[PDB]
Amino acid sequence: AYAQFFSDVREAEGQLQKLQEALRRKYSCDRSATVTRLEDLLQDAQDEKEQLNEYKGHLSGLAKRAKAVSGNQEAQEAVTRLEAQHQALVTLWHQLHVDMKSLLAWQSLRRDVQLIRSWSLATFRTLKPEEQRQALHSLELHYQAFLRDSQDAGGFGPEDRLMAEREYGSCSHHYQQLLQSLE
């Protein structure tokens, strides 16, 4: 009778391990990942996220069966060992998730900073005010997102927020300088 149970335990033990390797393989991104790809992977991650939630009822089901089995302590110590293993995945999923968001914000903020800093007075004049203001809308959107999502991100730190502010203000300054020439 313990066989049918411990077989299910070993089966459940394998799926979580398989799920761990799936997370690492799919969502370990670096600073060479494009914006479009990061966005795609971020919504893909939700599918893995939903499996983890549905696995709670699977673990609880084994927790019950574990109780209704001498060496019952071992049967319960095994399920407990799985719940610890499962929480690690949720913790891992969130870490990978918040890492991808930080990269996404960062990659976007780079596109904006480059764009705005590429402006010269001759290029600026050919632009409509709606187009000028738009580039600064996109700048603050991705700047403020970066300060927010880089916090729990392991790939970025306070020095990267320090620089971001500098790169951001850099463009605000350039913008303010370009406007002061047209008036």
Side-chain angles (χ1 to χ4, degrees), residues 9-27 48 51-52 55 82 85-86 88-89 92-93 96:
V9 168
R10 202 49 161 262
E11 173 194 295
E13 182 180 352
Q15 299 181 18
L16 298 181
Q17 178 58 225
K18 178 192 176 186
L19 210 56
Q20 177 180 4
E21 299 167 341
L23 294 175
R24 304 272 191 186
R25 185 188 67 227
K26 289 190 175 187
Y27 310 117
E48 265 82 6
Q51 300 185 24
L52 290 169
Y55 218 96
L82 299 183
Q85 178 177 355
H86 174 268
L89 299 188
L92 178 60
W93 184 96
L96 296 178

Side-chain angles (χ1 to χ4, degrees), residues 58-66 68-69 71-72 74-76 78-97:
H58 191 284
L59 290 170
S60 69
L62 289 187
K64 300 179 185 179
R65 291 171 48 187
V69 165
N72 192 95
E74 179 180 352
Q76 293 183 177
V79 174
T80 288
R81 190 180 278 104
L82 299 183
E83 293 172 343
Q85 178 177 355
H86 174 268
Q87 181 63 32
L89 299 188
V90 183
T91 309
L92 178 60
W93 184 96
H94 276 87
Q95 188 55 62
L96 296 178
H97 185 61

Side-chain angles (χ1 to χ4, degrees), residues 27 42 45 91-105 145-146 148-156:
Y27 310 117
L42 274 171
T91 309
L92 178 60
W93 184 96
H94 276 87
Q95 188 55 62
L96 296 178
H97 185 61
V98 71
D99 283 340
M100 289 183 299
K101 291 157 60 183
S102 57
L103 288 178
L104 173 63
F146 177 71
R148 184 191 65 236
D149 296 330
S150 68
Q151 305 286 341
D152 299 336
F156 302 94

Side-chain angles (χ1 to χ4, degrees), residues 106-127 129-169:
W106 184 81
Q107 290 286 6
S108 295
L109 175 53
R110 225 179 69 176
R111 192 222 313 107
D112 292 316
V113 154
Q114 177 176 355
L115 165 63
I116 299 182
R117 238 146 51 176
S118 161
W119 285 350
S120 60
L121 181 55
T123 285
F124 198 69
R125 272 203 285 259
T126 55
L127 243 56
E130 308 86 52
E131 312 182 281
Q132 299 170 2
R133 290 191 258 100
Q134 174 184 359
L136 280 96
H137 294 164
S138 185
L139 176 78
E140 173 139 358
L141 174 63
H142 303 127
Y143 168 66
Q144 286 292 335
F146 177 71
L147 310 172
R148 184 191 65 236
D149 296 330
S150 68
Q151 305 286 341
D152 299 336
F156 302 94
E159 66 283 355
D160 291 302
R161 302 170 215 128
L162 186 279
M163 273 300 301
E165 192 281 333
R166 195 183 295 188
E167 302 168 352
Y168 170 85

Side-chain angles (χ1 to χ4, degrees), residues 121 124 129 132-133 136 172-183:
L121 181 55
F124 198 69
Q132 299 170 2
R133 290 191 258 100
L136 280 96
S172 312
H173 189 269
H174 193 32
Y175 179 66
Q176 177 180 3
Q177 288 297 290
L178 290 167
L179 284 177
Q180 199 181 11
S181 298
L182 303 188
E183 65 187 54

